[PDB]
Amino acid sequence: AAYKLVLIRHGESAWNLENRFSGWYDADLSPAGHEEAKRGGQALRDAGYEFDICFTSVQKRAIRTLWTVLDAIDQMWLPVVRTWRLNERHYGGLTGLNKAETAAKHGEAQVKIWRRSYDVPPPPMEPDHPFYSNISKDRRYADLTEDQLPSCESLKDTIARALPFWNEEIVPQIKEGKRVLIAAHGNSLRGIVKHLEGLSEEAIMELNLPTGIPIVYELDKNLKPIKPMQFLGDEETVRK
Amino acid sequence: YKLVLIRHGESAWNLENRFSGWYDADLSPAGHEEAKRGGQALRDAGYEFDICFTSVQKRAIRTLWTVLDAIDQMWLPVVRTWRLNERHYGGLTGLNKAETAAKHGEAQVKIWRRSYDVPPPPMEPDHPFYSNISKDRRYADLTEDQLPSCESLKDTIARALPFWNEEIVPQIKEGKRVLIAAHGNSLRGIVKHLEGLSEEAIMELNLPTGIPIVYELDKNLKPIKPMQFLGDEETVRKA
Ligand SMILES: O=C1CCn2c(C(=O)O)cc3cc(Cl)cc(c32)N1
Numbered sequence: 145a146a147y148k149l150v151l152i153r154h155g156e157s158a159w160n161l162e163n164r165f166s167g168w169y170d171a172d173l174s175p176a177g178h179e180e181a182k183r184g185g186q187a188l189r190d191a192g193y194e195f196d197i198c199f200t201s202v203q204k205r206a207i208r209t210l211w212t213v214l215d216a217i218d219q220m221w222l223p224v225v226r227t228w229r230l231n232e233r234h235y236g237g238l239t240g241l242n243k244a245e246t247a248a249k250h251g252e253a254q255v256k257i258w259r260r261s262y263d264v265p266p267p268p269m270e271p272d273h274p275f276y277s278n279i280s281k282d283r284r285y286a287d288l289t290e291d292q293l294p295s296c297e298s299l300k301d302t303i304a305r306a307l308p309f310w311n312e313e314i315v316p317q318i319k320e321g322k323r324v325l326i327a328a329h330g331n332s333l334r335g336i337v338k339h340l341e342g343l344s345e346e347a348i349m350e351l352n353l354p355t356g357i358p359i360v361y362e363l364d365k366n367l368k369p370i371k372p373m374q375f376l377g378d379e380e381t382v383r384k
Numbered sequence: 385y386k387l388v389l390i391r392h393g394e395s396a397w398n399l400e401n402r403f404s405g406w407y408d409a410d411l412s413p414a415g416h417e418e419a420k421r422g423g424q425a426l427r428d429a430g431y432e433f434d435i436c437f438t439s440v441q442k443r444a445i446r447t448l449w450t451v452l453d454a455i456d457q458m459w460l461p462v463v464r465t466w467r468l469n470e471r472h473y474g475g476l477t478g479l480n481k482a483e484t485a486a487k488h489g490e491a492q493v494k495i496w497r498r499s500y501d502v503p504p505p506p507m508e509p510d511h512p513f514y515s516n517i518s519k520d521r522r523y524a525d526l527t528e529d530q531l532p533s534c535e536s537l538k539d540t541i542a543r544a545l546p547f548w549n550e551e552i553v554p555q556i557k558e559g560k561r562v563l564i565a566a567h568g569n570s571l572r573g574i575v576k577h578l579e580g581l582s583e584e585a586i587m588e589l590n591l592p593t594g595i596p597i598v599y600e601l602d603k604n605l606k607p608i609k610p611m612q613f614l615g616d617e618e619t620v621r622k623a
Protein backbone atom coordinates (compact mmCIF):
# COMPACT_ATOMS: atom_id res chain seq x y z
CA ALA A 145 0.00 0.00 0.00
CA ALA A 146 1.03 3.65 -0.25
CA TYR A 147 1.34 4.16 3.52
CA LYS A 148 1.66 2.26 6.78
CA LEU A 149 0.41 3.50 10.16
CA VAL A 150 1.07 1.98 13.59
CA LEU A 151 -0.97 2.55 16.76
CA ILE A 152 -0.34 1.29 20.28
CA ARG A 153 -2.64 1.51 23.27
CA HIS A 154 -0.89 1.71 26.65
CA GLY A 155 -1.28 -1.11 29.17
CA GLU A 156 -2.26 -1.42 32.82
CA SER A 157 -2.02 1.69 35.00
CA ALA A 158 -1.76 2.13 38.76
CA TRP A 159 -5.43 3.12 38.92
CA ASN A 160 -6.48 0.07 36.87
CA LEU A 161 -5.22 -2.02 39.80
CA GLU A 162 -7.55 0.04 42.00
CA ASN A 163 -10.30 -0.22 39.35
CA ARG A 164 -10.72 3.55 39.48
CA PHE A 165 -11.83 5.75 36.59
CA SER A 166 -8.69 7.66 35.47
CA GLY A 167 -9.71 9.68 32.44
CA TRP A 168 -7.60 12.82 32.55
CA TYR A 169 -5.99 11.94 35.88
CA ASP A 170 -2.30 11.33 35.11
CA ALA A 171 -1.92 7.77 36.42
CA ASP A 172 1.46 6.13 35.70
CA LEU A 173 1.87 2.67 34.22
CA SER A 174 1.94 -0.22 36.64
CA PRO A 175 4.99 -2.51 36.49
CA ALA A 176 2.93 -4.96 34.43
CA GLY A 177 1.78 -2.27 31.96
CA HIS A 178 5.38 -1.15 31.56
CA GLU A 179 6.32 -4.76 30.80
CA GLU A 180 3.56 -4.83 28.17
CA ALA A 181 5.04 -1.76 26.48
CA LYS A 182 8.38 -3.56 26.47
CA ARG A 183 6.84 -6.60 24.75
CA GLY A 184 5.16 -4.43 22.11
CA GLY A 185 8.40 -2.62 21.39
CA GLN A 186 10.20 -5.95 21.09
CA ALA A 187 7.57 -6.98 18.53
CA LEU A 188 8.19 -3.85 16.48
CA ARG A 189 11.97 -4.38 16.78
CA ASP A 190 11.78 -8.01 15.58
CA ALA A 191 9.63 -6.94 12.63
CA GLY A 192 12.18 -4.24 11.72
CA TYR A 193 9.76 -1.32 11.82
CA GLU A 194 11.10 2.21 11.30
CA PHE A 195 9.32 5.50 12.01
CA ASP A 196 9.87 9.18 11.23
CA ILE A 197 7.53 10.93 13.69
CA CYS A 198 5.57 9.99 16.81
CA PHE A 199 2.41 11.39 18.40
CA THR A 200 1.13 10.90 21.93
CA SER A 201 -1.04 12.56 24.58
CA VAL A 202 0.07 14.67 27.54
CA GLN A 203 -0.59 11.75 29.93
CA LYS A 204 2.43 9.87 31.23
CA ARG A 205 0.99 6.35 30.85
CA ALA A 206 0.95 6.87 27.07
CA ILE A 207 4.19 8.92 26.97
CA ARG A 208 6.01 6.21 28.97
CA THR A 209 4.59 3.58 26.64
CA LEU A 210 6.02 5.54 23.69
CA TRP A 211 9.38 6.00 25.47
CA THR A 212 9.62 2.26 26.16
CA VAL A 213 8.81 1.51 22.52
CA LEU A 214 11.37 3.95 21.13
CA ASP A 215 14.01 2.50 23.44
CA ALA A 216 13.23 -1.04 22.25
CA ILE A 217 13.48 -0.08 18.58
CA ASP A 218 16.58 2.18 19.09
CA GLN A 219 14.69 5.20 17.73
CA MET A 220 14.86 7.54 20.75
CA TRP A 221 16.08 10.29 18.39
CA LEU A 222 12.72 10.55 16.55
CA PRO A 223 10.69 13.76 16.86
CA VAL A 224 7.78 13.43 19.30
CA VAL A 225 4.61 15.55 19.35
CA ARG A 226 2.41 15.60 22.49
CA THR A 227 -1.22 16.79 22.45
CA TRP A 228 -4.13 16.89 24.90
CA ARG A 229 -6.38 15.95 21.95
CA LEU A 230 -5.05 12.38 22.16
CA ASN A 231 -5.90 12.14 25.88
CA GLU A 232 -8.15 9.47 27.33
CA ARG A 233 -11.85 10.22 27.60
CA HIS A 234 -12.61 12.75 30.37
CA TYR A 235 -14.82 10.83 32.83
CA GLY A 236 -15.98 13.94 34.69
CA GLY A 237 -17.29 13.36 38.18
CA LEU A 238 -16.63 9.64 37.90
CA THR A 239 -12.90 10.49 37.94
CA GLY A 240 -11.25 8.74 40.91
CA LEU A 241 -14.21 6.53 41.89
CA ASN A 242 -13.90 2.76 41.74
CA LYS A 243 -16.53 0.30 40.49
CA ALA A 244 -18.21 -0.04 43.88
CA GLU A 245 -18.32 3.68 44.62
CA THR A 246 -19.79 4.39 41.18
CA ALA A 247 -22.54 1.78 41.58
CA ALA A 248 -23.21 2.90 45.16
CA LYS A 249 -23.64 6.55 44.27
CA HIS A 250 -25.44 6.27 40.91
CA GLY A 251 -27.13 2.82 40.82
CA GLU A 252 -26.67 0.02 38.35
CA ALA A 253 -29.26 1.33 35.85
CA GLN A 254 -27.65 4.76 35.39
CA VAL A 255 -24.15 3.27 35.25
CA LYS A 256 -25.18 0.84 32.49
CA ILE A 257 -26.78 3.72 30.57
CA TRP A 258 -23.44 5.55 30.74
CA ARG A 259 -21.46 2.43 29.80
CA ARG A 260 -23.53 1.67 26.66
CA SER A 261 -24.30 5.20 25.49
CA TYR A 262 -22.40 6.97 22.70
CA ASP A 263 -23.34 10.56 23.48
CA VAL A 264 -24.62 10.72 27.09
CA PRO A 265 -21.80 12.23 29.18
CA PRO A 266 -21.17 11.35 32.82
CA PRO A 267 -21.72 14.08 35.41
CA PRO A 268 -19.45 17.13 35.23
CA MET A 269 -16.36 17.32 37.41
CA GLU A 270 -17.44 20.18 39.71
CA PRO A 271 -15.02 22.48 41.59
CA ASP A 272 -15.52 20.60 44.88
CA HIS A 273 -14.50 17.31 43.24
CA PRO A 274 -11.35 15.87 44.89
CA PHE A 275 -9.42 15.94 41.59
CA TYR A 276 -10.75 19.21 40.21
CA SER A 277 -7.65 21.27 40.93
CA ASN A 278 -5.36 18.36 40.04
CA ILE A 279 -6.78 18.15 36.51
CA SER A 280 -8.64 21.29 35.52
CA LYS A 281 -6.05 23.63 37.08
CA ASP A 282 -3.01 21.74 35.74
CA ARG A 283 -0.73 24.14 33.88
CA ARG A 284 -0.36 21.71 30.97
CA TYR A 285 -3.89 22.81 29.91
CA ALA A 286 -3.22 26.54 30.41
CA ASP A 287 -3.48 27.30 26.69
CA LEU A 288 -6.89 25.65 26.17
CA THR A 289 -9.87 27.91 25.59
CA GLU A 290 -12.82 27.86 28.01
CA ASP A 291 -14.84 25.78 25.54
CA GLN A 292 -11.98 23.32 24.99
CA LEU A 293 -11.28 22.36 28.61
CA PRO A 294 -13.97 19.70 29.25
CA SER A 295 -15.69 19.06 32.54
CA CYS A 296 -16.80 15.66 31.15
CA GLU A 297 -16.97 13.80 27.85
CA SER A 298 -19.10 11.27 26.11
CA LEU A 299 -17.30 9.07 23.63
CA LYS A 300 -18.74 11.38 20.96
CA ASP A 301 -17.13 14.45 22.59
CA THR A 302 -13.81 12.57 22.89
CA ILE A 303 -13.77 11.57 19.24
CA ALA A 304 -14.87 15.09 18.25
CA ARG A 305 -11.84 16.69 19.86
CA ALA A 306 -9.37 14.00 18.76
CA LEU A 307 -10.25 13.96 15.06
CA PRO A 308 -9.27 17.62 14.48
CA PHE A 309 -5.69 16.80 15.52
CA TRP A 310 -5.69 13.75 13.22
CA ASN A 311 -6.89 15.81 10.23
CA GLU A 312 -4.72 18.87 10.84
CA GLU A 313 -1.44 17.40 12.15
CA ILE A 314 -1.26 13.66 11.46
CA VAL A 315 -2.80 13.47 7.98
CA PRO A 316 -0.31 15.96 6.43
CA GLN A 317 2.65 14.04 7.88
CA ILE A 318 1.32 10.76 6.49
CA LYS A 319 0.73 12.25 3.04
CA GLU A 320 4.24 13.75 3.20
CA GLY A 321 5.48 10.14 3.39
CA LYS A 322 6.42 10.11 7.11
CA ARG A 323 5.99 6.78 8.88
CA VAL A 324 3.76 7.53 11.87
CA LEU A 325 3.56 5.91 15.31
CA ILE A 326 0.70 6.92 17.65
CA ALA A 327 0.91 5.96 21.34
CA ALA A 328 -2.35 6.87 23.01
CA HIS A 329 -5.46 5.63 24.86
CA GLY A 330 -8.45 3.36 24.25
CA ASN A 331 -11.01 6.03 23.50
CA SER A 332 -8.80 8.42 21.46
CA LEU A 333 -7.59 5.51 19.37
CA ARG A 334 -11.30 4.56 18.98
CA GLY A 335 -11.82 7.94 17.37
CA ILE A 336 -9.05 7.23 14.86
CA VAL A 337 -10.16 3.66 14.14
CA LYS A 338 -13.77 4.83 13.64
CA HIS A 339 -12.65 7.51 11.18
CA LEU A 340 -10.33 5.11 9.29
CA GLU A 341 -12.93 2.33 8.88
CA GLY A 342 -16.07 4.49 8.79
CA LEU A 343 -17.54 2.48 11.65
CA SER A 344 -20.99 3.01 13.21
CA GLU A 345 -21.54 4.29 16.75
CA GLU A 346 -22.53 0.79 17.84
CA ALA A 347 -19.55 -0.76 16.05
CA ILE A 348 -16.99 1.55 17.69
CA MET A 349 -18.57 1.12 21.13
CA GLU A 350 -18.10 -2.67 20.75
CA LEU A 351 -14.44 -2.38 19.68
CA ASN A 352 -11.91 -3.07 22.45
CA LEU A 353 -8.40 -2.40 21.18
CA PRO A 354 -5.78 -4.64 22.83
CA THR A 355 -3.20 -2.97 25.07
CA GLY A 356 0.53 -3.01 24.55
CA ILE A 357 0.26 -4.58 21.09
CA PRO A 358 1.28 -2.82 17.84
CA ILE A 359 -1.76 -2.32 15.58
CA VAL A 360 -0.74 -1.94 11.91
CA TYR A 361 -2.83 -0.33 9.15
CA GLU A 362 -1.91 -0.50 5.45
CA LEU A 363 -3.38 2.62 3.85
CA ASP A 364 -3.98 3.81 0.30
CA LYS A 365 -3.13 7.38 -0.68
CA ASN A 366 -6.51 8.61 0.61
CA LEU A 367 -5.77 6.98 4.02
CA LYS A 368 -8.38 4.29 3.61
CA PRO A 369 -7.36 0.83 4.86
CA ILE A 370 -6.74 -1.75 2.15
CA LYS A 371 -7.21 -4.62 4.64
CA PRO A 372 -8.19 -5.32 8.28
CA MET A 373 -5.95 -4.05 11.05
CA GLN A 374 -3.18 -6.44 12.02
CA PHE A 375 -1.54 -7.17 15.35
CA LEU A 376 2.20 -7.67 15.82
CA GLY A 377 3.61 -10.17 18.28
CA ASP A 378 4.36 -13.83 18.80
CA GLU A 379 1.65 -16.32 17.84
CA GLU A 380 0.33 -16.56 21.42
CA THR A 381 -0.24 -12.89 22.25
CA VAL A 382 -1.57 -12.21 18.74
CA ARG A 383 -4.11 -14.97 19.38
CA LYS A 384 -5.52 -13.15 22.42
CA TYR B 385 14.76 34.81 32.46
CA LYS B 386 15.90 31.47 33.89
CA LEU B 387 17.73 28.87 31.78
CA VAL B 388 18.90 25.41 32.90
CA LEU B 389 21.57 23.26 31.20
CA ILE B 390 22.38 19.69 32.09
CA ARG B 391 25.31 17.69 30.73
CA HIS B 392 24.86 13.91 30.67
CA GLY B 393 26.95 11.57 32.78
CA GLU B 394 28.96 8.43 32.14
CA SER B 395 28.27 6.30 29.05
CA ALA B 396 28.67 2.57 28.51
CA TRP B 397 32.01 0.79 28.02
CA ASN B 398 34.01 3.75 29.37
CA LEU B 399 33.26 5.54 26.09
CA GLU B 400 33.35 9.03 27.61
CA ASN B 401 37.08 8.30 28.05
CA ARG B 402 37.23 7.02 24.48
CA PHE B 403 36.24 10.03 22.37
CA SER B 404 32.63 8.81 22.21
CA GLY B 405 31.80 11.68 19.84
CA TRP B 406 29.00 10.96 17.34
CA TYR B 407 28.85 7.29 18.29
CA ASP B 408 25.41 6.83 19.91
CA ALA B 409 26.58 5.33 23.22
CA ASP B 410 23.95 4.74 25.88
CA LEU B 411 24.27 5.85 29.49
CA SER B 412 25.94 3.42 31.88
CA PRO B 413 23.95 2.57 35.02
CA ALA B 414 26.11 5.06 36.91
CA GLY B 415 25.43 7.84 34.38
CA HIS B 416 21.73 7.03 34.64
CA GLU B 417 21.92 7.43 38.45
CA GLU B 418 23.69 10.77 37.91
CA ALA B 419 20.71 11.88 35.81
CA LYS B 420 18.28 10.72 38.49
CA ARG B 421 20.20 12.77 41.08
CA GLY B 422 20.14 15.86 38.87
CA GLY B 423 16.40 15.52 38.29
CA GLN B 424 15.82 15.09 42.03
CA ALA B 425 17.77 18.28 42.66
CA LEU B 426 15.52 20.04 40.17
CA ARG B 427 12.40 18.65 41.87
CA ASP B 428 13.57 19.56 45.38
CA ALA B 429 14.10 23.12 44.10
CA GLY B 430 10.62 23.15 42.50
CA TYR B 431 11.79 24.04 39.00
CA GLU B 432 9.24 24.20 36.18
CA PHE B 433 9.96 24.30 32.45
CA ASP B 434 7.94 24.99 29.33
CA ILE B 435 10.12 23.54 26.53
CA CYS B 436 13.13 21.21 26.38
CA PHE B 437 15.99 20.93 23.85
CA THR B 438 18.37 18.00 23.36
CA SER B 439 20.57 16.23 20.78
CA VAL B 440 19.77 13.19 18.61
CA GLN B 441 22.12 11.13 20.82
CA LYS B 442 20.48 8.74 23.24
CA ARG B 443 22.77 9.42 26.25
CA ALA B 444 21.55 13.02 26.23
CA ILE B 445 17.94 12.03 25.43
CA ARG B 446 17.84 9.45 28.24
CA THR B 447 19.30 12.06 30.60
CA LEU B 448 16.47 14.44 29.70
CA TRP B 449 13.85 11.65 30.00
CA THR B 450 15.15 10.85 33.49
CA VAL B 451 14.95 14.49 34.55
CA LEU B 452 11.43 14.94 33.16
CA ASP B 453 10.31 11.79 34.98
CA ALA B 454 11.86 12.99 38.26
CA ILE B 455 10.14 16.40 38.08
CA ASP B 456 6.77 15.02 36.82
CA GLN B 457 6.96 16.97 33.56
CA MET B 458 7.00 14.19 30.93
CA TRP B 459 4.26 16.16 29.10
CA LEU B 460 6.60 19.02 28.11
CA PRO B 461 7.41 19.52 24.42
CA VAL B 462 10.84 18.23 23.44
CA VAL B 463 12.93 19.29 20.44
CA ARG B 464 15.83 17.09 19.24
CA THR B 465 18.59 18.45 17.00
CA TRP B 466 21.84 17.09 15.59
CA ARG B 467 23.16 20.64 16.14
CA LEU B 468 23.46 19.91 19.88
CA ASN B 469 25.40 16.68 19.32
CA GLU B 470 28.75 16.04 20.98
CA ARG B 471 31.86 17.12 19.10
CA HIS B 472 32.69 14.74 16.25
CA TYR B 473 36.20 13.36 17.03
CA GLY B 474 36.78 11.86 13.59
CA GLY B 475 39.24 8.99 13.38
CA LEU B 476 39.87 9.15 17.12
CA THR B 477 36.30 8.13 18.00
CA GLY B 478 36.29 4.98 20.14
CA LEU B 479 40.03 5.01 21.06
CA ASN B 480 41.32 5.29 24.60
CA LYS B 481 44.29 7.51 25.52
CA ALA B 482 46.97 4.85 25.08
CA GLU B 483 45.61 3.80 21.68
CA THR B 484 45.46 7.44 20.57
CA ALA B 485 49.09 8.10 21.54
CA ALA B 486 50.20 4.79 20.03
CA LYS B 487 48.56 5.60 16.70
CA HIS B 488 49.36 9.31 16.39
CA GLY B 489 52.19 10.15 18.78
CA GLU B 490 52.29 12.32 21.87
CA ALA B 491 53.18 15.56 20.09
CA GLN B 492 50.26 15.43 17.61
CA VAL B 493 47.72 14.42 20.26
CA LYS B 494 48.84 17.32 22.43
CA ILE B 495 48.35 19.68 19.48
CA TRP B 496 44.77 18.41 18.95
CA ARG B 497 44.00 18.61 22.68
CA ARG B 498 45.27 22.18 23.02
CA SER B 499 44.04 23.65 19.71
CA TYR B 500 40.75 25.44 19.05
CA ASP B 501 40.68 25.14 15.26
CA VAL B 502 42.68 22.04 14.19
CA PRO B 503 40.45 18.98 13.67
CA PRO B 504 41.51 15.41 14.30
CA PRO B 505 41.88 13.21 11.24
CA PRO B 506 38.62 12.36 9.46
CA MET B 507 36.86 9.12 10.18
CA GLU B 508 37.71 6.89 7.19
CA PRO B 509 35.71 4.02 5.64
CA ASP B 510 37.93 1.54 7.49
CA HIS B 511 36.99 2.99 10.88
CA PRO B 512 34.69 0.59 12.79
CA PHE B 513 32.10 3.38 13.23
CA TYR B 514 32.25 4.84 9.70
CA SER B 515 29.07 3.33 8.26
CA ASN B 516 27.35 3.19 11.66
CA ILE B 517 27.52 7.00 11.94
CA SER B 518 27.81 8.42 8.44
CA LYS B 519 24.96 6.36 6.93
CA ASP B 520 22.69 6.58 10.00
CA ARG B 521 19.10 7.40 9.00
CA ARG B 522 18.95 10.34 11.38
CA TYR B 523 21.52 12.31 9.36
CA ALA B 524 20.03 11.59 5.92
CA ASP B 525 18.73 15.14 5.33
CA LEU B 526 22.09 16.75 6.18
CA THR B 527 23.95 18.35 3.27
CA GLU B 528 27.50 17.19 2.55
CA ASP B 529 28.89 20.36 4.11
CA GLN B 530 26.79 19.76 7.24
CA LEU B 531 27.59 16.14 8.04
CA PRO B 532 31.10 16.13 9.58
CA SER B 533 33.80 13.59 9.11
CA CYS B 534 35.52 15.38 12.06
CA GLU B 535 35.28 18.68 13.92
CA SER B 536 37.55 21.16 15.59
CA LEU B 537 36.02 22.74 18.68
CA LYS B 538 35.45 25.79 16.47
CA ASP B 539 33.46 23.62 14.05
CA THR B 540 31.27 22.23 16.85
CA ILE B 541 30.42 25.65 18.27
CA ALA B 542 29.81 27.06 14.77
CA ARG B 543 27.15 24.45 14.04
CA ALA B 544 25.56 24.57 17.52
CA LEU B 545 25.09 28.34 17.76
CA PRO B 546 22.82 28.74 14.72
CA PHE B 547 20.31 26.49 16.49
CA TRP B 548 20.64 28.52 19.69
CA ASN B 549 20.08 31.80 17.84
CA GLU B 550 17.17 30.61 15.68
CA GLU B 551 15.26 28.22 18.00
CA ILE B 552 16.15 28.71 21.65
CA VAL B 553 16.50 32.50 21.84
CA PRO B 554 12.93 33.15 20.58
CA GLN B 555 11.59 30.84 23.28
CA ILE B 556 13.61 32.55 26.04
CA LYS B 557 12.33 35.89 24.72
CA GLU B 558 8.71 34.67 24.80
CA GLY B 559 9.18 33.95 28.52
CA LYS B 560 9.26 30.16 28.19
CA ARG B 561 11.47 28.46 30.78
CA VAL B 562 14.00 26.44 28.81
CA LEU B 563 15.82 23.22 29.72
CA ILE B 564 18.77 21.99 27.60
CA ALA B 565 20.11 18.43 27.95
CA ALA B 566 23.18 18.14 25.75
CA HIS B 567 26.93 17.36 25.77
CA GLY B 568 30.23 18.89 26.92
CA ASN B 569 31.30 20.61 23.71
CA SER B 570 27.85 21.77 22.50
CA LEU B 571 27.13 23.22 25.93
CA ARG B 572 30.59 24.85 25.73
CA GLY B 573 29.38 26.57 22.57
CA ILE B 574 26.32 27.94 24.36
CA VAL B 575 28.28 29.02 27.44
CA LYS B 576 30.89 30.74 25.26
CA HIS B 577 28.18 32.76 23.50
CA LEU B 578 26.39 33.62 26.77
CA GLU B 579 29.51 34.72 28.67
CA GLY B 580 31.50 35.99 25.68
CA LEU B 581 34.41 33.79 26.71
CA SER B 582 37.65 33.62 24.75
CA GLU B 583 38.88 30.50 22.94
CA GLU B 584 41.47 29.72 25.63
CA ALA B 585 38.88 30.31 28.38
CA ILE B 586 36.26 28.04 26.78
CA MET B 587 38.87 25.32 26.24
CA GLU B 588 39.63 25.50 29.97
CA LEU B 589 35.93 25.19 30.95
CA ASN B 590 34.96 21.65 32.05
CA LEU B 591 31.23 21.69 32.88
CA PRO B 592 30.24 19.11 35.53
CA THR B 593 27.96 16.21 34.60
CA GLY B 594 24.54 15.34 35.99
CA ILE B 595 24.33 18.75 37.69
CA PRO B 596 21.65 21.31 36.80
CA ILE B 597 23.40 24.50 35.65
CA VAL B 598 21.27 27.61 36.24
CA TYR B 599 21.63 30.88 34.29
CA GLU B 600 19.82 34.14 35.11
CA LEU B 601 19.54 36.29 31.99
CA ASP B 602 18.49 39.93 31.52
CA LYS B 603 16.46 41.42 28.68
CA ASN B 604 19.43 41.09 26.30
CA LEU B 605 20.04 37.41 27.26
CA LYS B 606 23.22 38.47 29.01
CA PRO B 607 23.99 36.61 32.27
CA ILE B 608 23.47 38.73 35.38
CA LYS B 609 25.46 36.43 37.69
CA PRO B 610 27.88 33.50 37.37
CA MET B 611 26.42 30.09 36.59
CA GLN B 612 25.11 28.33 39.72
CA PHE B 613 24.78 24.61 40.44
CA LEU B 614 21.92 22.68 42.06
CA GLY B 615 22.24 19.85 44.55
CA ASP B 616 23.01 19.10 48.14
CA GLU B 617 25.84 21.20 49.56
CA GLU B 618 28.38 18.38 49.20
CA THR B 619 28.15 18.00 45.43
CA VAL B 620 27.51 21.73 44.89
CA ARG B 621 30.82 22.70 46.53
CA LYS B 622 32.74 20.06 44.54
CA ALA B 623 31.33 21.60 41.35
O1 LIG C 1 -14.46 2.19 27.68
C1 LIG C 1 -15.29 2.12 28.54
C2 LIG C 1 -15.81 0.76 29.03
C3 LIG C 1 -15.80 0.45 30.52
N1 LIG C 1 -16.83 1.20 31.27
C4 LIG C 1 -17.47 0.60 32.30
C5 LIG C 1 -17.33 -0.82 32.84
O2 LIG C 1 -18.02 -1.17 33.84
O3 LIG C 1 -16.56 -1.66 32.30
C6 LIG C 1 -18.36 1.55 32.83
C7 LIG C 1 -18.21 2.74 32.03
C8 LIG C 1 -18.83 4.01 32.09
C9 LIG C 1 -18.46 5.00 31.16
CL1 LIG C 1 -19.18 6.65 31.15
C10 LIG C 1 -17.49 4.74 30.21
C11 LIG C 1 -16.85 3.47 30.13
C12 LIG C 1 -17.22 2.48 31.06
N2 LIG C 1 -15.82 3.36 29.06
Ligand SMILES: O=C1CCn2c(C(=O)O)cc3cc(Cl)cc(c32)N1
Pocket residue numbers: 493496497503504568
Ligand atom coordinates in the same frame (compact mmCIF):
# COMPACT_ATOMS: atom_id res chain seq x y z
O1 LIG D 1 37.11 18.42 25.48
C1 LIG D 1 38.17 17.91 25.26
C2 LIG D 1 39.20 17.72 26.38
C3 LIG D 1 39.96 16.40 26.55
N1 LIG D 1 40.84 16.01 25.44
C4 LIG D 1 41.98 15.31 25.69
C5 LIG D 1 42.53 14.84 27.03
O2 LIG D 1 43.60 14.17 27.05
O3 LIG D 1 41.92 15.08 28.10
C6 LIG D 1 42.60 15.05 24.47
C7 LIG D 1 41.75 15.65 23.47
C8 LIG D 1 41.86 15.71 22.07
C9 LIG D 1 40.86 16.36 21.35
CL1 LIG D 1 40.92 16.47 19.59
C10 LIG D 1 39.78 16.94 21.99
C11 LIG D 1 39.66 16.91 23.39
C12 LIG D 1 40.65 16.24 24.12
N2 LIG D 1 38.42 17.55 23.88
Ligand SMILES: [Cl-]
Pocket residue numbers: 224462
Ligand atom coordinates in the same frame (compact mmCIF):
# COMPACT_ATOMS: atom_id res chain seq x y z
CL1 LIG E 1 10.30 12.74 24.15
